[PDB]
Amino acid sequence: NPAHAHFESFLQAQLCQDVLSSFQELCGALGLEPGGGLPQYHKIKDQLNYWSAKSLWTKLDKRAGQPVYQQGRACTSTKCLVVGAGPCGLRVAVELALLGARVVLVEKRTKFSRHNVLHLWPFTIHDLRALGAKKFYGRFCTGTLDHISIRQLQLLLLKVALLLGVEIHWGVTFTGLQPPPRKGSGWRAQLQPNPPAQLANYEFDVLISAAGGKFVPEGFKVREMRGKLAIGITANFVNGRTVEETQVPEISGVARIYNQSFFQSLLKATGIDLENIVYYKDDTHYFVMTAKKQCLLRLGVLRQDWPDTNRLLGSANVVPEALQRFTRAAADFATHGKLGKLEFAQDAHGQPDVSAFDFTSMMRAESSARVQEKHGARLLLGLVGDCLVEPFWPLGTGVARGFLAAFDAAWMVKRWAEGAESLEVLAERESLYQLLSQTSPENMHRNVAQYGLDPATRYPNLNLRAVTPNQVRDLYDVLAGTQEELLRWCQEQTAGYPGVHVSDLSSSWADGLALCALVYRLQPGLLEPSELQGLGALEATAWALKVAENELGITPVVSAQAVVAGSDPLGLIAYLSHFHSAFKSSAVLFLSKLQRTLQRSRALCALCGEHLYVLERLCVNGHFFHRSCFRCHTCEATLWPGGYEQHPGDGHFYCLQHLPPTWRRTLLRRAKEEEMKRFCKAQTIQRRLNEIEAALRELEAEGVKLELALRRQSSSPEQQKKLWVGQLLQLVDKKNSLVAEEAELMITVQELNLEEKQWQLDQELRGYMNREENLKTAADRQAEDQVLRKLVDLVNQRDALIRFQEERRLSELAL
Ligand SMILES: Cc1cc2nc3c(=O)[nH]c(=O)nc-3n(C[C@H](O)[C@H](O)[C@H](O)COP(=O)(O)OP(=O)(O)OC[C@H]3O[C@@H](n4cnc5c(N)ncnc54)[C@H](O)[C@@H]3O)c2cc1C
Ligand SMILES: [Zn+2]
Ligand SMILES: [Zn+2]
């Protein structure tokens, strides 16, 4: 039959134009018009007797037979417009089609020309399989494979949407909305170029934007989360499908957190300075990596060091040949050269498929839904995909969170069609959206086979009232004195101590007894007799600083000499504000004491000469540096307690790494998922650290500007000075909170580092211990002697860390 051949060509097509032509021919052979909705899907299923393409109809009917859809009657009177035909746009189009609505989709492009590989969560894999992914794609997730190229996913979803009866227009670009000018008329979309009269005269009730990237409809507010400057590089190599390429195992690594030996070896051998790397064995060998500006400049990948990052990575600034050599070297070192000769795949323009991207900042919208009313007509606008939350590619959360957003948007549309008020709909949507940025395979229902539109099948302990309708009224359209409390708290804490009085916040501390009194009051029964009978001339202040640093976990901001001299009042104010914020109602102290023990176990900035300010100060060994000046001399990496050392010979700091049946299937799948979980944890830690560093830089710059303005203009009114000091104290509080969070992160980083080092050391020990009595020499004995003490030290540190964690958990469960 002609219909059978047409259906086979439709299933096996590999190009968008081929899919469209095959579907047009198939609909012509059946006397049908594409875009007829659910009725034409029923007609195709009934009138196509294939006897081998029957499991597909079973899967589609099982999916469409859920009670939530009400047999395509939940949204039978609503009209929708989807902008963009990416994976998320096609997914939401399919979801809206199943509910029984009329879906019109518009795509700017006319081809699917993206070969990059996306990672898939288990529920995403099950969801795609339930739609008949194996029929449309033979190699879909066979074995432990959990990824798919962008164009293959797009083709699969396009075939499903075409079968379900969705009208799709290609080459049309959405630009804006046409408001109704008269009563009784709906909304229309501005499209470029001039569209067919049927499309241009189409009035819709729902607008779902899935344009991804940075596109956003007017009326939506988007804010970007920034980070340290990172340069991403993606590359695709042709996969020969030979056996030798199949035994090559996939690898992944993150800087100094996960799989560090790879990065150290790669830097030592080739000179490639990377931050993270991920490799995928999909239809093409896919490599994604992160690199820094210095290495790219050194190797000639970039021409000039332009401060503007937009011009830094422009087409006129990158050298394609240098980039190709860079990527080839990184890839062939990553896979031990087992892949043989690597030959780049070709993109749409015939160039090699290697590219560079900006990985610094990610956009995200403040709200995921809006309502606009004019002449009594109401329009609901929703965001799905990258246009809602921009993903970090190495983390592999794009498809999963896009699908979750699509499900939530379809649920919102179904609630909207029921006649519920706009405010409650928006409140529920925002309540659901509040959880999107923290979604993970671990904190959702483990029964992924029961997922659906209803949020209760996906989000545990769901609260649909987490946002009240009064907080979303702006999304509906119709057409200070911290100083006084600080002084009062100091006065009330100093009270009861004999021989002291606090009348101000600047000169009362010159005596030096007040600091000791405060430290004694915070923790009772520490000391007293030594200072009373002792001289205590400028030594009381230093002792108070030392005991506060070593016991109360508060780093000093102002030197004791400046305290007694009174030449640094703002530093004293910042110190007292840290005291006030700490006990207004730890990890830093633990890290400091660990660094002190490591240092003992061996038994005006002073580096750059520019003036230090109150916020940029960082005190160590009794000396103050810029927070940004504390880096290793060789790798120029940020130093943290417990992993740095100082050489008195040169007076420099160096890091420790620079200091001179199906049972087998299920088992393998669980092992791969655990490895992916570890990598994701490390990558999330690294990303959060970069964000914290960027925020600290921004707040330090702002505080320096404020403090310089306060100092230079000494004729300002007193109230403005009070306001400036209040803002400075708020900045100090924010900086302290960020530092505490960073210390919390470094605790886990240290745990991971010691675990990895212990594993490597035991592997080395078991390698040494394989030699028998016949193979014995002084070298083996020395190796055993040198490794045993290392194992002793690491296990001692492991007991120290588990003791700290046990104490923390006991304190948490105390209350
Ligand atoms: C070049 C590129 C490379 C990527 N590489 C990776 C990678 O290696 N790993 C990874 O995890 N993620 C990667 N992504 C992101 C990945 O595509 C998304 O995570 C995921 O595909 C979600 O797609 P989306 O529909 O939200 O956005 P997209 O698929 O990017 O956008 C949807 C579509 O909307 C269309 N469109 C745009 N503007 C308009 C308009 N005005 N009118 C009509 N249609 C419009 C575009 O043609 C686009 O194809 C990449 C994205 C791009 C653009
Ligand atoms: Zn400095
Ligand atoms: Zn170093």
Residue numbers in the entry: 8 to 486, 508 to 613, 630 to 647, 696 to 752, 907 to 1061
Excerpt from the paper describing this PDB structure:
MICALs are a phylogenetically conserved family of actin regulatory enzymes that bind and disassemble actin filaments (F-actin). In particular, MICALs bind directly to F-actin and stereospecifically oxidize two conserved methionine residues (Met44 and Met47) into methionine sulfoxides. MICALs are large, multidomain intracellular proteins.
We determined the structure of the human MICAL1 using single-particle cryo-EM to a nominal resolution of 3.1 Å. Analogous to its murine counterpart, the human MO domain comprises two subdomains of distinct sizes interconnected by two beta-strands (MOβ9 and MOβ15). The interaction between the MO and CC domains is primarily mediated by the CCα1 helix, wedged within a shallow cavity between the large and small subdomains of the MO. The interface between the MO and CC domains is extensive, burying a total solvent-accessible area of 2554 Å2. A key feature of the MO-CC interaction involves a region between MOβ17 and MOα15, potentially acting as a molecular switch. This region includes Trp400, which stabilizes the FAD’s isoalloxazine ring through coaxial stacking, and adjacent Phe399, stabilizing the MO-CC interaction via a cation-π interaction with Arg933 from the CCα1 helix. In the cryo-EM structure, the CH domain binds to the CC domain. The LIM domain engages the central part of the CCα1 and CCα2 mainly through hydrophobic contacts. Given the high quality of the cryo-EM density in this region, we confidently modeled this helix within the L2 linker (residues 630–647), which we have labeled L2α1. This helix is wedged between the CC, CH, and LIM domains and plays a crucial role in the stability of the CH-LIM-CC assembly. These observations suggest that the binding site for the CCα1inh helix on the MO domain partially or fully overlaps with the F-actin binding site.
